[PDB]
Write an enzyme that holds these catalytic residues in place. Sequence first.
Site, mmCIF file in Angstrom:
data_model
loop_
_atom_site.group_PDB
_atom_site.id
_atom_site.type_symbol
_atom_site.label_atom_id
_atom_site.label_comp_id
_atom_site.label_asym_id
_atom_site.label_seq_id
_atom_site.Cartn_x
_atom_site.Cartn_y
_atom_site.Cartn_z
ATOM 1 N N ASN A 161 0.940 -0.905 -0.259
ATOM 2 C CA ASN A 161 0.416 0.025 0.002
ATOM 3 C C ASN A 161 0.923 1.610 -0.291
ATOM 4 O O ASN A 161 1.929 0.885 0.300
ATOM 5 C CB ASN A 161 -1.350 -0.018 1.193
ATOM 6 C CG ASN A 161 -2.204 -1.115 0.972
ATOM 7 O OD1 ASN A 161 -1.859 -1.670 2.809
ATOM 8 N ND2 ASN A 161 -2.765 -1.156 0.212
ATOM 9 N N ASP A 180 1.262 3.660 1.389
ATOM 10 C CA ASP A 180 1.279 3.955 3.612
ATOM 11 C C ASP A 180 2.543 3.082 3.586
ATOM 12 O O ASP A 180 2.990 3.414 5.097
ATOM 13 C CB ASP A 180 0.201 4.139 4.823
ATOM 14 C CG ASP A 180 -0.241 2.774 5.062
ATOM 15 O OD1 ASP A 180 0.067 1.639 4.101
ATOM 16 O OD2 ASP A 180 -0.806 2.975 5.601
ATOM 17 N N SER A 234 2.912 -0.148 3.854
ATOM 18 C CA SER A 234 2.009 -1.492 4.898
ATOM 19 C C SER A 234 1.551 -1.936 3.806
ATOM 20 O O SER A 234 1.750 -1.633 2.554
ATOM 21 C CB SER A 234 0.495 -0.971 5.507
ATOM 22 O OG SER A 234 -0.156 -0.230 4.794
ATOM 23 N N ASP A 244 -0.719 -5.734 2.213
ATOM 24 C CA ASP A 244 -1.591 -7.093 2.426
ATOM 25 C C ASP A 244 -1.019 -8.599 2.357
ATOM 26 O O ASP A 244 -0.197 -8.442 1.220
ATOM 27 C CB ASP A 244 -2.909 -5.998 1.939
ATOM 28 C CG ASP A 244 -3.378 -4.927 1.752
ATOM 29 O OD1 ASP A 244 -3.613 -4.528 3.036
ATOM 30 O OD2 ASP A 244 -4.421 -4.375 1.076
ATOM 31 N N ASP A 272 -14.439 -5.815 14.375
ATOM 32 C CA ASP A 272 -14.559 -4.424 15.075
ATOM 33 C C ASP A 272 -15.123 -3.511 14.989
ATOM 34 O O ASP A 272 -15.011 -2.209 15.170
ATOM 35 C CB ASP A 272 -12.948 -4.047 14.633
ATOM 36 C CG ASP A 272 -12.805 -3.461 13.216
ATOM 37 O OD1 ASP A 272 -14.202 -3.155 12.847
ATOM 38 O OD2 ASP A 272 -11.773 -3.344 12.817
#
Length: 129
Positions: free
Chosen positions: A46, A48, A50, A52, A101
Amino acid sequence: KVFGRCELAAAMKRHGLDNYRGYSLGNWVCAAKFESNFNTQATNRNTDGSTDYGILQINSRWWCNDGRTPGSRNLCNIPCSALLSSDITASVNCAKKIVSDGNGMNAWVAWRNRCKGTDVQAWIRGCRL
Ligand SMILES: [Cl-]
Ligand SMILES: [Cl-]
Ligand SMILES: [Cl-]
Ligand SMILES: [Cl-]
Ligand SMILES: [Cl-]
Ligand code: NA
């Protein structure tokens, strides 16, 4: 491992995802199809920084540790590499935490954009379950 559609449906069902938090099995299969094309080894980076991971494209920013996402959390308490296994147990357990969540399956962009509001039962049609 690249699952077949019905093979994955049956694995998901055995691991307790059918109607988990109200989401029928077809929802999970649809999400897996569009997130990873049923490939447990799928990775995507991604913007940013990060990444997946796995059949449900679980993100390192919140849910697993990959040692290269500074400032991230590891809420599923697992190395992200565990999510690439041919055994989908880790991915399912973590997904159950994600969908509990508060945001439900909207946490999966492909589910929101390609599965939500569609006839998701079609994804399990024909399967022996
Ligand atoms: Cl369904
Ligand atoms: Cl596509
Ligand atoms: Cl990290
Ligand atoms: Cl919900
Ligand atoms: Cl689509
Ligand atoms: Na992390």
